[PDB]
Design a protein around this ligand. Structure first.
Ligand SMILES: Cc1ccc(NC(=O)c2ccc(CN3CCN(C)CC3)cc2)cc1Nc1nccc(-c2cccnc2)n1
Ligand SMILES: [Cl-]
Ligand SMILES: [Cl-]
Ligand SMILES: [Cl-]
Ligand SMILES: [Cl-]
Length: 274
């Protein structure tokens, strides 16, 4: 917009510059469309807001939040169109889609053990950065990660709460939570911190080591807490290095203060990967 204007925002861009297309992922992400940033012949993802919905306040808050973060392993904000409806939030488009489906559909000969370790290392790096900035993710899981070229992985947040139609998210006082990725303190006291993100990261590592399997297979949601309290934890996935599993259990300590920090988790992975 206008550089001299009192309301100048470098991120605001021209709605006309983007060629809007079909909805991304057959609708799995919601009101997110594939687009073409003409000026650069660049394919992008454009999240928008339904036909004037009572969520503008939340939408704009997301946009503001994204303008505050930047890291090679966090989906990159490219611009916004929150001056006049329909509101837009544009980020890069990741060629191979979300990590969950990527892991389930990949060439396992290509996506070997070293590659899995590499993917977990990139994710821990992004979280280490959010930790540093005192930000909290709240919904860390393979489904919220994107895969680019050369196994580049980036953490995102698609606000899947009401989008998912499966048993991943379950109701709780007008809100939905992915019970199998939620820390005990979060299920019991609605307390979310970077430590509950670390617990969720533990589950994510499990998803990665199993090439995308569902957590606590077979166990019904209503008994998960009790079991975690009884000190039950997921077994070491087949082929999962001892060191990585050791990391998993540390993330699953009942007491959050006893869980390693992402700084420690990442430092550990670097050592390993090398
Ligand atoms: C178009 C868009 C708009 C917004 C976002 N937002 C985020 O990804 C995100 C990540 C981290 C935070 C940080 N925030 C801190 C506070 N806590 C509570 C929540 C998280 C916020 C938003 C992503 C996108 N990108 C996006 N969205 C859906 C699908 C895809 C997609 C799908 C397939 C291939 N390529 C891209 N890409
Ligand atoms: Cl500026
Ligand atoms: Cl996807
Ligand atoms: Cl936050
Ligand atoms: Cl890409």
């Amino acid at each position: 917009m206008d550089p001299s204007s009192p309301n100048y925002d470098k991120w605001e861009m021209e709605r006309t510059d983007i060629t809007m297309k079909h909805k991304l992922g057959g609708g799995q992400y919601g009101e997110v469309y594939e687009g073409v940033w003409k000026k650069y012949s660049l394919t992008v993802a454009v999240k928008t807001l339904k036909e004037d919905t009572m969520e503008v306040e939340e939408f704009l808050k997301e946009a503001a939040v994204m303008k505050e973060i930047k890291h090679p392993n966090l989906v990159q904000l490219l611009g916004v169109c929150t001056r006049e409806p329909p509101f837009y939030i544009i980020t890069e488009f990741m060629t191979y889609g979300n990590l969950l489906d990527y892991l389930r559909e990949c060439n396992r000969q290509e996506v070997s053990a070293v590659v899995l370790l590499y993917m977990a290392t990139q994710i821990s790096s992004a979280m280490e950065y959010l930790e540093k900035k005192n930000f909290i993710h709240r919904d860390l899981a393979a489904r919220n990660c994107l895969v680019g070229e050369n196994h580049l992985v980036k953490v995102a947040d698609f606000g899947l709460s009401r989008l998912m139609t499966g048993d991943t998210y379950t109701a709780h006082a007008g809100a939905k939570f992915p019970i199998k990725w939620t820390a005990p303190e979060s299920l019991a006291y609605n307390k979310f911190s970077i430590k509950s993100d670390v617990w969720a990261f533990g589950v994510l590592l499990w998803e990665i080591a199993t090439y995308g399997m569902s957590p606590y297979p077979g166990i019904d949601l209503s008994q998960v807490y009790e079991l975690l309290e009884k000190d039950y934890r997921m077994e070491r996935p087949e082929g999962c290095p001892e060191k990585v599993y050791e990391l998993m259990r540390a993330c699953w300590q009942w007491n959050p203060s006893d869980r390693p920090s992402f700084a420690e988790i990442h430092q550990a992975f670097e050592t390993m990967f090398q």
